[PDB]
């Protein structure tokens, strides 16, 4: 029907009243309705986040930091990159340098959006490169033509998903993990921009280079590209300063200094370079007056404000389940769960989140699964990073059917790509992604964070 999720919303609040007895059932009812509206997306993912703060007081259950500074500093750069169309110039420049094209054009279209989705969002990059890739494939073919379109679509979407890793500020499921982690463990200083990039870039490079070979074997065995570049025009003043500030912020992030009062952090670099976008004149004379590179309404458009509401709603639901009396019941109900090998819990939880993320949303899976796996990690006396590092990477591995993330729903709205093509292509990419994450969590991420010893910022 049409009015589906008004009657699905109002017709699950009616049978679910197990509420007509003790308090832990009243908290189970809140947990059920919030999880059901998060999984099915009947409400827009932050109206649901405000529902525990409405429903827990009526039953009787009662209750800025550096990551926000870094998020402000990266959104300031991303708004200027997307606004002045620098992101189209540095996508058509990676193509035409790699594009020898027996099969290197697929690698160029993968590497462009993989680099671009480290900074922008996956949805915006997948919506930007797909017209360019469609025009390039059309004007190369008009000079086997059906498999190139679906290969190009899948190589855009999957590599925009893969490039969405390697940065904490690259996807929303990374922002949610970082905001959960620095709130639950505020005595921990080992997770920042560079330490995330250092362990996540060797994984994503291997996943990209293996997915290229997999898709190129699965589907298949000059002036046409140097004409969409000249339709961009010449280079403007507003995107040379954005490029210079990009290069300066990038090589100031990864290069950490010597002095030590309090300001050698990443949020200092983020604010100190990203607040120059409001100040530097664009040479866009308002007419007596000038205009900057970035105004405040555009920043407010680009800034994710609902992520903090989502983290606060998840934390409120977790404390409601703690102080209501429910977590004791399911904690004494699941006592043989802590007699497992610690790597088997990694395996079953990673397969669980990467199976659930194919039909659910990427923030909705990780917001439900982080307060399940954190006290389990503290209880069985393993490192709480050892459990939570592979689960946030396996939640991003949404490569099957186009209901999981909007990156492969954008490339699906075009005429090509049957659903069985997406399923058969994304199954091998999911397999190699889980295999590379399992290799990494036992080979190179172990000495980087000392995962085999219980930490000191944990209870």
Ligand X SMILES: CC(C)CCC[C@@H](C)[C@H]1CC[C@H]2[C@@H]3CC=C4C[C@@H](O)CC[C@]4(C)[C@H]3CC[C@]12C
Q: Write out the residues near ligand X by the rule CB under 6 A.
A: 317-318, 321, 327, 330-331, 334-335, 337-338, 371-372, 375-376, 379-380
Neighbours of 107 (CB within 10 A): 22
Which range in 258-266, 268-276, 361-369, 438-446 contacts Na ion by CB under 5 A?
A: 361-369
CB 264 within 8 A of CB 256: yes
Q: Does 9 bind its own copies (CB under 8 A)?
A: yes
- Could you say which residues in the range 119-138 bind Na ion, by CB under 5 A? 121-122
Tell me the Cα Rg of the chain: 24
Tell me, what DSSP letter sits at residue 335?
A: G
337's enclosing H/E stretch is none
User: Binding string, 54-93, against its own copies, x = CB under 8 A?
Assistant: x--xxxx-x-xx---x--x---------------------
Q: Does 53 bind its own copies (CB under 8 A)?
A: yes
Contacts of 263 (CB under 8 A, 6+ apart): none
Q: Which of 22, 183, 227, 300 contacts its own copies by CB under 8 A?
A: 300
Distance CA 308, CA 283 (A): 36
Q: Which of 108, 164, 363, 402 contacts Na ion by CB under 5 A?
A: 164
Question: 254 vs 290, which CB is nearer to its own copies?
Answer: 290
* Nearest distance in Å: CB 230, its own copies: 33
224 φ/ψ angles, rounded to the nearest 5 degrees: -75, -25
State the binding partner of 362 from Na ion, ligand X, its own copies, none, CB within 5 to 8 A by kind: Na ion
State the binding partner of 64 from ligand X, Na ion, its own copies, none, CB within 5 to 8 A by kind: its own copies
Return the residues preceding each gap in the chain, C–N over 2.5 A, or none: 63, 143, 221, 256, 287
Contacts of 264 (CB under 8 A, 6+ apart): 256, 257
15 φ/ψ angles, rounded to the nearest 5 degrees: -85, -30
Q: Does 357 bind Na ion (CB under 5 A)?
A: yes
CB 136 within 8 A of CB 95: yes
- Could you say which residues in the range 212-271 bind Na ion, by CB under 5 A? none
Binding footprint of its own copies on the chain (CB under 8 A): 2-3, 6, 9, 43-44, 46-47, 50-51, 53-54, 57-60, 62, 64-65, 69, 72, 261-263, 265, 267-268, 271-272, 275, 278-281, 285, 288-290, 295-296, 300-301, 303, 305-306, 309, 312
């Amino acid at each position: 029907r049409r009015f589906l999720f008004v009657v699905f919303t109002v017709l699950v609040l009616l049978p679910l009243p197990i509420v007509l007895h003790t308090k832990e059932a009243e908290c189970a009812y809140t947990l059920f309705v919030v999880a059901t509206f998060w999984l099915t997306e009947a409400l827009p993912l932050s109206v649901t986040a405000l529902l525990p703060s409405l429903m827990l007081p009526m039953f009787g259950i009662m209750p800025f930091k550096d990551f926000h500074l870094l998020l402000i500093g990266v959104i300031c750069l991303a708004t200027s990159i997307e606004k002045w169309n620098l992101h189209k110039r540095i996508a058509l420049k990676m193509v035409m340098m790699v594009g020898v094209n027996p099969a290197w054009l697929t690698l160029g279209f993968m590497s462009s959006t993989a680099f671009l989705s480290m900074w922008l969002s996956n949805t915006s990059t997948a919506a930007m490169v797909m017209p360019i890739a469609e025009a390039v494939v059309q004007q190369i073919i008009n000079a086997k033509g059906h498999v190139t379109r679906k290969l190009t679509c899948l190589c855009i979407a999957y590599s925009s998903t893969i490039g969405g890793l390697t940065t904490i500020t690259g996807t929303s499921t990374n922002l949610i993990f970082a905001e959960y982690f620095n709130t639950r463990y505020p005595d921990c200083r080992c997770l920042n921009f560079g330490s995330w990039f250092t362990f996540s870039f060797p994984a994503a490079l291997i996943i990209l280079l293996l997915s290229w070979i997999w898709l190129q074997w699965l589907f298949l065995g000059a002036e046409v590209i140097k004409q969409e570049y000249q339709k961009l025009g010449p280079i403007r003043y507003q995107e040379i300063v954005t490029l210079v500030l990009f290069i300066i912020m990038a090589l100031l992030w990864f290069s950490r200094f010597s002095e030590y009062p309090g300001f050698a952090t990443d949020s200092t670099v983020a604010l100190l370079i990203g607040l120059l976008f409001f100040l530097i004149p664009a040479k866009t004379l308002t007419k007596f007056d000038y205009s900057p590179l970035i105004t405040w309404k555009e920043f407010q458009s680009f800034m994710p404000w609902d992520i903090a509401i989502l983290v606060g709603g998840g934390f409120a639901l977790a404390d409601g389940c703690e102080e209501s009396g429910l977590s004791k019941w399911i904690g004494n109900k699941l006592s043989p769960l802590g007699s497992l090998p610690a790597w088997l819990i990694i395996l079953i939880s990673s397969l669980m989140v990467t199976s659930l993320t194919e039909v659910a949303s990427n923030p909705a899976t990780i917001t439900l699964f982080l307060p399940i796996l954190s006290p389990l990690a503290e209880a069985i006396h393993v490192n709480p990073l050892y459990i939570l590092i592979p689960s946030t990477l396996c939640t991003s591995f949404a490569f099957l059917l186009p209901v999981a993330n909007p990156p492969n729903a954008i490339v699906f709205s075009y005429g090509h790509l049957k659903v069985i093509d997406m399923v058969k292509a994304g199954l091998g990419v999911n397999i190699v992604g889980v295999a590379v994450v399992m290799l990494g969590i036992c080979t190179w991420i172990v000495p980087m964070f000392d995962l085999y010893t219980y930490p000191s910022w944990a209870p």
